């Protein structure tokens, strides 16, 4: 509350650490379904069903232009990529499996870093 704060956490390295995690995400061999926005003109149903599309290149642009006020907002967009993937793809599919793998890969790097 007012004039009552927890000991101040060093958040000066968060931006660079999130960039590092995103670079690791972008270079994983199963990152290919998430590198660029899903093409809404070429994929029927996607624009209608997925209300908040998200991909690694949009995340990179947002991170690089100061559009993440904190750690949590970055993690929400990364998780949104995989929540969208689960909504539109069968678990038993290459993209469906790519999503589950990339999520597990992200969550470990996220716990280990922060
Ligand atoms: C994350 N991608 C999808 O949920 C997706 C769903 C149906 C059809 C195509 C899709 O993504 C393409 C992205 C570019 O590479 C090939 C798949």
Swiss-Prot record:
Subcellular location: Nucleus
Domain Bromo as annotated: residue spans: 9-113
Domain of life: Eukaryota
Tissue: Expressed at varying levels in several tissues, whereas a smaller transcript was expressed specifically in testis.
Subunit structure and binding partners: Component of the BRF-1 ISWI chromatin remodeling complex, at least composed of SMARCA1 and BAZ2B, which regulates the spacing of histone octamers on the DNA template to facilitate access to DNA. Within the BRF-1 ISWI chromatin remodeling complex interacts with SMARCA1; the interaction is direct. Component of the BRF-5 ISWI chromatin remodeling complex, at least composed of SMARCA5/SNF2H and BAZ2B, which regulates the spacing of histone octamers on the DNA template to facilitate access to DNA.
Family to which this protein belongs: Belongs to the WAL family.
Role this protein plays: Regulatory subunit of the ATP-dependent BRF-1 and BRF-5 ISWI chromatin remodeling complexes, which form ordered nucleosome arrays on chromatin and facilitate access to DNA during DNA-templated processes such as DNA replication, transcription, and repair. Both complexes regulate the spacing of nucleosomes along the chromatin and have the ability to slide mononucleosomes to the center of a DNA template. The BRF-1 ISWI chromatin remodeling complex has a lower ATP hydrolysis rate than the BRF-5 ISWI chromatin remodeling complex.
Name by which UniProt lists this protein: Bromodomain adjacent to zinc finger domain protein 2B
Native species: Homo sapiens (Human)
Shown segment, full-protein numbering: 2054 to 2165 of 2168
